[PDB]
Amino acid sequence: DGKRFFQADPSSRIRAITDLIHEIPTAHNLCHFKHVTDYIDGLCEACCIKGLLRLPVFTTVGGRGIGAGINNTPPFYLLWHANDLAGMLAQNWQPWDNMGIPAWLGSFQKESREVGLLAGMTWLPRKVYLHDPVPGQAACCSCGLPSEALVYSCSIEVEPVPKGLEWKDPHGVYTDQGKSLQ
């Protein structure tokens, strides 16, 4: 009960924790290649963290009344590769003069125009709560690790992206007209 990582205040729109993961079917999706059922199988803490990190980069439209993320349709992502973590960090180090405030800090604000790097790289288009883990002896449906109490449900609300918001992704690829290249 306090500050949460990549989360916000609770709501009443209850959804099973499966829409954070694209490959596991949920709601109206057909469960043929992955036999799952909502509120029956859940994810562990590591998978919850890994699914909270997919919001800024891999969020698509929700149909009616729900928009996409900061990058609109998720485009190609091109970067540089190295044989170790330090090398990969050292080959894509280019900083900017304006950094902004990261999302894991205090309550993020859209505020005025311009974004920077830390704010843009951690844009949160949805509010999520991650209620609690429920005791049991099941296994995670994402990694398969035989574990203990998992989470099953959460609350998700939609945050619209204000008009304007001049942003250029360091890794995204754009077209001639400025649209995302997918």
Partner RNA sequence: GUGAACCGGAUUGCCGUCAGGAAAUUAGGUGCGCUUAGCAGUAUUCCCCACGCUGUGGG
CA distance 52 to 96: 25
Q: Give whichever of 33 and 93 is closer to RNA, judged by the CB atom.
A: 33
Under the binding rule (CB under 7 A), the answer on residue 131 touching RNA is no
Please tell me the total number of residues recorded for the chain in this structure. 182
Under the binding rule (CB under 7 A), the answer on residue 33 touching RNA is yes
Under the binding rule (CB under 7 A), the answer on residue 34 touching RNA is yes
Which candidate, 9, 6, 26, 24, places its Cα nearest to that of 124? Answer: 6
Under the binding rule (CB under 5 A), the answer on residue 52 touching Mg ion is no
Q: Give whichever of 143 and 165 is closer to RNA, judged by the CB atom.
A: 143
Q: Is 141 annotated as a binding residue?
A: no
Q: Which of 1, 27, 30, 32 binds RNA (CB under 7 A)?
A: 32
Residues in the annotated binding site? 47, 140, 143
